[PDB]
RNA sequence: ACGAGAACAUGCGCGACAUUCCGAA
């Protein structure tokens, strides 16, 4: 059992908005600072694997499963991207 | 003689078993308190010889607020359940009682009119074996608790010294605890010893009928001549030696039978402080000395 | 002559403390029949305590002339009568106050190994705010042992303060801290105000 | 007193002319976070923090009925803007938790109702 | 009156038991036991291995006996005493009949037997109904095998009935003009019979132990539930037998297997006696705060109420045991604020909306509430896993 | 001579923390004080299936009591006859005094309702979700004590409990987690052998 | 010389597995 951290920088190129004015962008609470959730990126990523609970076997294994009978653990665990400080 | 009222006030539960430790009883006898003061006494390096020759205590009977309650006379009473089931009547109904003039819904009323405690079970565990690769053992505790108002009371019958002495033990009994986990935290009680006015007045009368108070039973020579027309009842007062000298390991008493509390005789008849121990270290005492409460029948 | 020193003080609650036994409750605590209010046996309290002094002396001569003993040839009465501790009457008022429950229950889960599925659990737990009123009697038997047992009675004390008392602990519960009010010699000429705990 | 507000306003299910938890998540996640506040001070009086912080409650009592006329309906039915002046005007912590029990019990009653 | 004054010559006779000489020979001991049997807790009986007084280890052996056979004989040899110095023991009717042909002076008991041929038995009607013994994997555990299920709180239930106003129905109950011995007599053998061998039939299929049915009272063991369903079964077969006029109260407790017997009766005993009181017609079910009618108990608590709640969270995923804990929490305080908090509780139930009225309207009313407290209880712990 | 070394400090929650309980989904609150709390049966949890995992898993295992020996000494085993107590027993962390100062300023509401929401593969329609989280800026005072049974035993022990509050640190310890919630990461103010003679100066978990 | 005396209702256990605040302008 192995863990392997990916530390990186998410860069927004357009206005990025995840509305947690109509919508406010979602917000970290202690900073108010915008955030994008883990699960925002961890669900698109889910979905256009998917499309490139039900899904492929490779994909079930990789963000998590919970068929019954059959639990497997997400691989995957994307946290929430909080707003950089250099930024 | 003199006549003190102790009242006890219980703070935590008590166990007062009749055979088993899954007992919950609310009162004990007698010869349950005097062995309680005996064990005080000699804790206490007092003397002996003012229980054992003097001291006549009566059982522990329930109290509550504006009531205290005696033992049910076994009286023929001239719904017939009632009187069956009761087990303890009020003092400003004992002189009622004897007489008559309880019908079977008043004794009923009264035995519901008892608001002494509640009884329960508490379940614990031994672990001294799971250590050495065992299983826990789940014994059961029988403990009776008291309501706020509710408690035990017994008289005292000595002379100054006597009564005295008592007000010593009764105040080192309070942290002794009286009962049978009183080193689980069952019996811890405060007691307070005051002259009682409403129980001289009932003492003082002298009816044709003789009413036992504690567990007593009479000698030979003294049963000869009381058991005549008697109504009574047999108690097999049995149990363990609670002593560090007796023997080495925890051997039973002799079986002593003694009168219930509530008896009617005839024929008073003083008791004894009867030995019930078998070539131990030292004598045990079961106390069975009378405690008399004359009434009209 | 024999002496006994009432050690009377709290038991204030530092994580909900669950001793297993109203109506029907997922894993009850223990309470007073009558008063229906969460208690600590005094059981559950000399037994703790003789857990935690026996593990810290190594049954010891020690163990066994503090917490009782009934063996063959040697039988020592127990010197302490730890009561049961009840819920004291200034939490209650406090709990009442804040319209808190005497008791709350806590909700927990086991994820199997095989199938990782959780299995939800309910035990019953006092709640943090909590003080129980302890007390404890001290037969002082010997006039010379009084201070190594009220040294021993210290650590066993000390431990329990840095252990739980009865329930699942180990994941949390059963933490508590001990304040004494008062060490009073009730009966007997020994004296107790060199004498203290913790 | 809750259980009959929530009646009388309760219509065939359309409450308070269309009102759900969604549209009181706002208000109620202040008074919640309020009553976490007088909760942990052990004091017989409101705080004066808290007291500024409850007027900012009342202006966001307004401010939501402008937004959702549902919300609107249910405020003035109701006399919870009227009962957050009480409060402030007695500026007793007990008088506040009889409030806050009272929109619990609104709320709770207007989920029963639904 | 002639059985009034029977009746109180016995009650003259049981106060003075003993004579000076018996008195004197119960406190003339000459040595303590120092070793008691487990059961019995004798001394002075001689107890042998195991730890079992002669009485006992006899009543023992009369178990596994008294399951497999039907034939009580009464003979020189035998497992317990009996006077005029003889024993009894439980044999097969070859073993029997060996023993009644050895000796003469020997009594053979038969158990709820029809009539055959010409032989010295004598019929007993006795009530041995017994559900383990179905089963010979259960007949190992006899009522420890109660506490066997695959769903629902493992506890026992103890059912102690018994008829009010037994002994006002002969004295009172029977008219001036209808009062004879032979009139009485009848009366005795339709109530004996009842007990004895009826009661088998009414518990058929059940998980219960009769330990005593005789005359006047009641004594079973087994499942809590089956316990009460045919305590229940038993009321209303009870007010068949009796055309009315004769009711029973009953107490009922619910505990678990290596609770203390002696706890197990006593504790329902007292719960007979709550029940005892009053108008007599009453069931006491589990704690002192049950004391239902059995009318109540059976429609009120459990069909009314108890069936609805397990019928609704049956439907769902989960067999509830979470919005029931918390109604119960809610349920037992008596603040204005938590009957809103069950309000709550109920709308987010996702249950039916008609019983989510029903349950706010039971919880309103006092002596209704108890009720569906009752049978949230009840419905918990027909969920336990 | 029994000893036990006490390790006590703070719990930052990284990401939203959300340990749920009783009362969309209500984060598990102390009743006395309404507070957001970590139980104790979270982390000793967390920290023991973590560690499982990490010293590997026997195929098939039925049980909890079936982990390596050396996870049944540091956490408890139950397998009778063979019991073992627990070395490690972990409390929970509840909100800290300091951190609930400093959610005073700024008015902080100590949680924060995270709106999620499911999209259907089939019918491509949102079902939404809220979900109560602990605050980012948050910090639970934790507190753990480590009994002695075995002098020998405890550089393994505080050895594996460096593997657990390591793996700890980068997992999450209730809610979502892969979808975000639950990070951690653990700060030792301090370690001290309360009772016992136990040399705890040379020990260390983070 | 209290049916006594000794006895932890205790041990193991994540409220957890999947879940885009999203489509339309
Ligand atoms: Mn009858
Ligand atoms: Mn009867």
Same mark, same amino acid.
């Given at each position: 059992?192995?863990?392997?951290?990916?530390?990186?920088?998410?860069?927004?190129?357009?206005?990025?908005?995840?509305g947690?004015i109509?919508?406010p962008?979602?917000?970290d609470?202690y900073?108010?600072?915008?955030?994008?959730?883990?699960?925002?990126?961890?669900?698109?990523?889910?979905?256009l694997?998917?499309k490139?609970?039900?899904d492929?076997?490779?994909?079930?294994?990789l963000?998590?499963?919970?068929?019954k009978?059959?639990?497997?653990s997400s691989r995957?665990?994307?946290?929430?991207?909080?707003?950089?400080?250099?930024? | 003689?003199?006549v003190?009222?102790?009242?006890?006030?219980?703070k935590?539960?008590?166990?007062?078993?009749?055979?088993?430790?899954?007992?919950?009883?609310?009162?004990?006898?007698?010869?349950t308190?005097?062995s309680?003061?005996?064990?005080?006494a000699?804790?206490?390096?007092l003397?002996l010889?003012?229980?054992?020759?003097?001291?006549?205590?009566?059982?522990?009977?329930?109290?509550?607020?504006?009531?205290?309650?005696?033992?049910?006379?076994?009286?023929?009473?001239?719904?017939?359940?009632?009187?069956?089931?009761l087990?303890?009547?009020?003092?400003?109904?004992?002189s009622?009682?004897?007489?008559?003039?309880?019908?079977?819904?008043?004794?009923?009323?009264?035995?519901?009119?008892?608001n002494?405690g509640?009884?329960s079970?508490?379940?614990?565990?031994?672990?001294?074996?799971?250590?050495?690769?065992?299983?826990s053992?789940?014994y059961?505790?029988?403990?009776?608790?008291?309501?706020?108002?509710?408690?035990?009371?017994?008289?005292?019958?000595?002379?100054?010294?006597?009564?005295?002495?008592?007000?010593?033990?009764?105040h080192?009994?309070?942290?002794?605890?009286?009962?049978?986990?009183?080193?689980?935290?069952?019996?811890?009680?405060?007691?307070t010893?005051?002259?009682?006015?409403?129980?001289?007045?009932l003492?003082?009368?002298?009816?044709?009928?003789?009413?036992?108070?504690?567990?007593?039973?009479?000698?030979?020579?003294?049963?000869?001549?009381?058991?005549?027309?008697?109504?009574?009842?047999?108690?097999?007062?049995?149990?363990?030696?609670?002593?560090?000298?007796?023997?080495?390991?925890?051997?039973?008493?002799?079986?002593?039978?003694?009168f219930?509390?509530?008896?009617?005789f005839?024929?008073?008849?003083?008791?004894?402080?009867?030995?019930?121990?078998?070539?131990?270290?030292?004598?045990?005492?079961?106390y069975?000395?009378?405690?008399?409460?004359?009434?009209?029948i | 002559?024999?002496?006994?020193?009432?050690?009377?003080g709290?038991?204030?609650?530092?994580?909900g403390?669950?001793?297993?036994?109203?109506?029907?409750?997922?894993?009850?605590?223990?309470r007073?029949?009558?008063?229906?209010?969460?208690?600590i046996?005094?059981?559950?309290?000399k037994?703790?305590?003789?857990?935690?002094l026996?593990?810290?002396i190594?049954?010891?001569?020690?163990?066994?002339?503090?917490?009782?003993?009934?063996?063959?040839?040697?039988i020592?009465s127990?010197?302490?009568?730890?009561?049961?501790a009840?819920?004291?009457?200034?939490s209650?008022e406090?709990?009442?106050?804040?319209?808190?429950?005497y008791?709350?229950?806590?909700?927990?889960?086991?994820?199997?190994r095989?199938?990782?599925?959780?299995n939800?659990?309910?035990?019953?737990?006092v709640?943090?705010?909590?003080?129980?009123?302890?007390?404890?009697?001290?037969n002082?038997?010997?006039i010379?042992?009084?201070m190594?047992?009220?040294?021993?009675?210290?650590?066993?004390?000390?431990?329990?303060?840095?252990?739980?008392?009865?329930?699942?602990?180990?994941?949390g519960?059963g933490?508590?801290?001990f304040?004494?009010?008062?060490?009073?010699?009730?009966?007997?000429?020994?004296?107790?105000?060199?004498?203290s705990?913790? | 007193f809750?259980?009959?507000?929530?009646?009388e306003?309760?219509?065939?299910?359309?409450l308070?002319?269309?009102l759900?938890?969604?549209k009181l998540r706002?208000?109620?996640?202040?008074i919640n976070?309020?009553?976490?506040?007088?909760?942990? !001070?052990?004091?017989?009086?409101?705080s004066?923090?808290?007291?500024?912080?409850?007027?900012?409650?009342?202006?966001?009592?307004?401010?939501? !009925?402008?937004?959702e006329p549902?919300?609107?309906?249910?405020?003035?039915?109701?006399?919870?803007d009227?009962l957050?002046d009480?409060?402030?005007k007695?500026?007793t912590?007990?008088?506040?938790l009889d409030?806050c029990?009272?929109?619990?019990?609104?709320?709770?009653?207007?989920?029963?109702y639904? | 009156?002639?059985?009034?004054?029977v009746? =109180?010559k016995?009650?003259?006779?049981?106060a003075?038991?003993?004579?000076?000489?018996?008195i004197?020979?119960?406190?003339?001991?000459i040595?303590?036991?120092?070793?008691?049997?487990?059961?019995?807790?004798?001394?002075?009986?001689?107890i042998?291995?195991?730890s079992?007084?002669?009485?006992?280890?006899?009543i023992?052996?009369?178990?596994n006996?008294? =399951?497999?056979?039907?034939?009580?004989?009464v003979?020189?040899?035998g497992k317990?005493?009996?006077?005029?110095? =003889?024993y009894?023991s439980?044999?097969?009717?070859d073993?029997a009949?060996?023993k009644?042909?050895?000796?003469k002076?020997? =009594?053979?008991?038969?158990?709820?037997?029809p009539?055959?041929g010409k032989?010295?038995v004598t019929?007993?009607?006795?009530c041995?109904?017994?559900?383990?013994?179905?089963?010979?994997?259960?007949?190992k555990?006899?009522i420890?095998?109660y506490?066997?299920?695959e769903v629902?709180?493992?506890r026992?239930?103890?059912?102690?009935?018994?008829?009010?106003?037994?002994?006002?129905?002969?004295?009172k109950?029977?008219?001036?003009?209808?009062?004879?011995?032979?009139?009485t007599?009848?009366?005795?053998?339709?109530?004996?019979?009842?007990?004895?061998?009826?009661l088998?039939?009414?518990?058929?299929?059940?998980?219960?132990?009769?330990?005593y049915?005789?005359?006047?009272?009641?004594?079973?063991?087994?499942?809590?539930?089956?316990?009460?369903s045919?305590?229940?079964?038993?009321?209303?077969?009870?007010?068949?037998?009796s055309?009315g006029?004769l009711?029973?109260?009953?107490?009922?407790?619910m505990?678990?297997?290596?609770y203390?017997?002696?706890?197990?009766?006593?504790?329902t005993?007292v719960?007979?006696?709550?029940?005892?009181?009053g108008?007599?017609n009453?069931?006491?079910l589990?704690?002192?705060?049950?004391?239902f009618?059995?009318?109540?108990?059976?429609?009120?608590?459990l069909?009314?109420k108890?069936?609805?709640?397990?019928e609704?969270?049956?439907?769902?995923?989960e067999?509830?045991?979470?919005?029931l804990?918390?109604?119960?929490?809610?349920?037992?305080?008596e603040?204005?604020?938590?009957?809103?908090?069950?309000?709550y509780?109920?709308?987010?139930?996702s249950?039916?909306?008609?019983?989510?009225?029903?349950?706010?309207?039971?919880?309103?009313?006092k002596?209704?509430?108890?009720?569906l407290?009752?049978?949230?209880?009840?419905?918990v712990?027909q969920?336990?896993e």
């Amino acid at each position: 059992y192995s863990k392997i951290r990916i530390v990186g920088k998410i860069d927004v190129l357009t206005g990025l908005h995840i509305g947690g004015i109509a919508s406010p962008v979602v917000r970290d609470p202690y900073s108010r600072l915008p955030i994008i959730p883990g699960s925002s990126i961890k669900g698109k990523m889910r979905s256009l694997l998917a499309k490139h609970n039900q899904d492929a076997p490779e994909i079930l294994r990789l963000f998590g499963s919970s068929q019954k009978g059959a639990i497997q653990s997400s691989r995957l665990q994307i946290s929430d991207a909080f707003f950089s400080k250099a930024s | 003689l003199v006549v003190k009222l102790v009242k006890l006030t219980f703070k935590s539960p008590v166990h007062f078993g009749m055979k088993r430790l899954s007992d919950s009883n609310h009162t004990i006898a007698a010869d349950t308190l005097f062995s309680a003061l005996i064990i005080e006494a000699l804790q206490q390096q007092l003397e002996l010889s003012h229980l054992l020759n003097n001291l006549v205590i009566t059982d522990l009977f329930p109290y509550n607020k504006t009531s205290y309650f005696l033992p049910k006379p076994l009286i023929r009473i001239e719904g017939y359940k009632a009187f069956k089931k009761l087990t303890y009547i009020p003092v400003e109904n004992y002189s009622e009682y004897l007489r008559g003039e309880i019908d079977s819904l008043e004794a009923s009323k009264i035995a519901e009119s008892l608001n002494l405690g509640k009884a329960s079970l508490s379940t614990k565990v031994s672990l001294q074996a799971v250590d050495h690769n065992g299983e826990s053992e789940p014994y059961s505790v029988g403990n009776f608790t008291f309501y706020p108002e509710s408690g035990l009371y017994f008289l005292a019958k000595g002379n100054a010294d006597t009564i005295g002495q008592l007000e010593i033990l009764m105040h080192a009994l309070q942290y002794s605890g009286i009962g049978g986990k009183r080193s689980a935290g069952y019996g811890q009680f405060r007691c307070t010893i005051e002259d009682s006015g409403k129980f001289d007045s009932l003492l003082s009368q002298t009816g044709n009928i003789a009413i036992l108070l504690s567990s007593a039973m009479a000698s030979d020579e003294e049963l000869v001549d009381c058991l005549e027309d008697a109504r009574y009842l047999l108690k097999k007062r049995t149990g363990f030696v609670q002593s560090k000298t007796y023997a080495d390991q925890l051997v039973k008493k002799k079986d002593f039978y003694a009168f219930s509390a509530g008896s009617t005789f005839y024929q008073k008849f003083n008791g004894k402080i009867f030995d019930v121990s078998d070539n131990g270290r030292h004598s045990v005492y079961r106390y069975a000395k009378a405690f008399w409460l004359e009434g009209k029948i | 002559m024999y002496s006994k020193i009432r050690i009377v003080g709290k038991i204030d609650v530092l994580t909900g403390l669950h001793i297993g036994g109203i109506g029907a409750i997922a894993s009850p605590v223990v309470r007073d029949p009558y008063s229906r209010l969460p208690i600590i046996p005094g059981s559950s309290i000399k037994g703790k305590m003789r857990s935690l002094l026996a593990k810290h002396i190594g049954d010891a001569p020690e163990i066994l002339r503090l917490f009782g003993s009934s063996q063959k040839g040697a039988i020592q009465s127990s010197r302490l009568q730890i009561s049961d501790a009840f819920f004291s009457k200034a939490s209650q008022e406090e709990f009442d106050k804040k319209d808190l429950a005497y008791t709350e229950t806590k909700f927990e889960n086991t994820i199997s190994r095989l199938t990782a599925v959780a299995n939800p659990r309910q035990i019953e737990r006092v709640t943090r705010g909590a003080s129980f009123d302890f007390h404890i009697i001290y037969n002082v038997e010997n006039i010379n042992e009084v201070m190594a047992d009220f040294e021993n009675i210290k650590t066993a004390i000390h431990l329990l303060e840095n252990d739980y008392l009865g329930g699942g602990g180990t994941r949390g519960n059963g933490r508590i801290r001990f304040v004494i009010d008062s060490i009073d010699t009730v009966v007997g000429d020994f004296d107790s105000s060199n004498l203290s705990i913790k | 007193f809750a259980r009959k507000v929530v009646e009388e306003n309760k219509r065939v299910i359309v409450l308070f002319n269309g009102l759900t938890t969604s549209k009181l998540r706002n208000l109620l996640e202040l008074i919640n976070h309020v009553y976490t506040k007088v909760y942990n !001070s052990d004091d017989t009086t409101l705080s004066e923090d808290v007291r500024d912080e409850l007027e900012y409650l009342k202006v966001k009592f307004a401010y939501e !009925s402008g937004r959702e006329p549902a919300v609107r309906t249910f405020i003035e039915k109701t006399y919870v803007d009227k009962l957050v002046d009480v409060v402030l005007k007695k500026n007793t912590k007990k008088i506040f938790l009889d409030y806050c029990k009272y929109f619990e019990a609104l709320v709770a009653y207007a989920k029963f109702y639904r | 009156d002639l059985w009034q004054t029977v009746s =109180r010559k016995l009650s003259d006779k049981k106060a003075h038991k003993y004579s000076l000489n018996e008195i004197k020979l119960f406190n003339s001991t000459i040595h303590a036991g120092t070793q008691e049997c487990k059961e019995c807790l004798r001394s002075d009986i001689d107890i042998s291995e195991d730890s079992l007084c002669k009485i006992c280890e006899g009543i023992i052996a009369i178990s596994n006996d008294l =399951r497999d056979y039907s034939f009580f004989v009464v003979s020189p040899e035998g497992k317990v005493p009996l006077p005029r110095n =003889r024993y009894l023991s439980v044999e097969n009717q070859d073993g029997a009949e060996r023993k009644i042909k050895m000796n003469k002076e020997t =009594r053979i008991y038969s158990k709820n037997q029809p009539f055959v041929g010409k032989q010295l038995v004598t019929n007993l009607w006795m009530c041995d109904y017994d559900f383990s013994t179905l089963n010979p994997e259960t007949k190992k555990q006899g009522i420890a095998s109660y506490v066997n299920r695959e769903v629902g709180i493992p506890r026992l239930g103890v059912l102690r009935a018994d008829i009010d106003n037994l002994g006002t129905t002969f004295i009172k109950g029977i008219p001036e003009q209808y009062r004879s011995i032979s009139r009485t007599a009848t009366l005795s053998r339709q109530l004996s019979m009842f007990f004895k061998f009826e009661l088998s039939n009414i518990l058929k299929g059940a998980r219960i132990s009769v330990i005593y049915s005789g005359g006047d009272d009641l004594f079973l063991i087994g499942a809590w539930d089956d316990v009460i369903s045919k305590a229940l079964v038993l009321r209303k077969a009870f007010t068949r037998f009796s055309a009315g006029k004769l009711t029973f109260s009953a107490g009922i407790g619910m505990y678990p297997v290596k609770y203390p017997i002696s706890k197990m009766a006593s504790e329902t005993g007292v719960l007979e006696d709550l029940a005892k009181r009053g108008e007599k017609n009453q069931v006491a079910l589990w704690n002192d705060s049950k004391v239902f009618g059995w009318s109540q108990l059976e429609e009120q608590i459990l069909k009314e109420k108890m069936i609805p709640l397990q019928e609704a969270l049956t439907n769902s995923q989960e067999h509830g045991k979470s919005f029931l804990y918390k109604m119960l929490e809610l349920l037992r305080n008596e603040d204005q604020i938590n009957i809103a908090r069950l309000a709550y509780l109920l709308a987010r139930s996702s249950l039916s909306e008609e019983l989510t009225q029903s349950i706010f309207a039971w919880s309103q009313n006092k002596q209704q509430k108890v009720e569906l407290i009752t049978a949230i209880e009840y419905l918990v712990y027909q969920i336990r896993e």
